[PDB]
Write a protein that binds this DNA or RNA. Sequence first.
RNA 1: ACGGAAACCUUGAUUCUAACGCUACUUCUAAAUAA
Length: 104
Amino acid sequence: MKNFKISSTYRAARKQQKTANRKSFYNDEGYMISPSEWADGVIKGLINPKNSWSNDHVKGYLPRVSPRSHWTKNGYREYLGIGKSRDIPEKEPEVIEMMDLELV
RNA sequence: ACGGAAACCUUGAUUCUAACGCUACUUCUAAAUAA
């Protein structure tokens, strides 16, 4: 993810709701396991330590993500997800079908 | 110059009539956490 970053409000919410202090651990099949067997499996190589845990849940429907910015050639700030992009949209696909009995 | 000679245990008769390999059932559910 380069077009976006973690929002500061979500980071603060995760910080002092203390969700990182209540991690859950999973094995290679994604089944919940205690930290002791997670450590055992990671040491023996039967678990990938990277993608095998979760940071509980942040309460409150907060947006996880904000747009990330960059510098233009003018030295101005600009969102990374906006720009020249491309140009191919056509108009639509008008499929006629002026006979369907539309229910009220 | 045999208690001997001549005599088919033979004739016809469907192991046949009726009966659903049948009943319910979406090749389908879950996307966390991190960035």
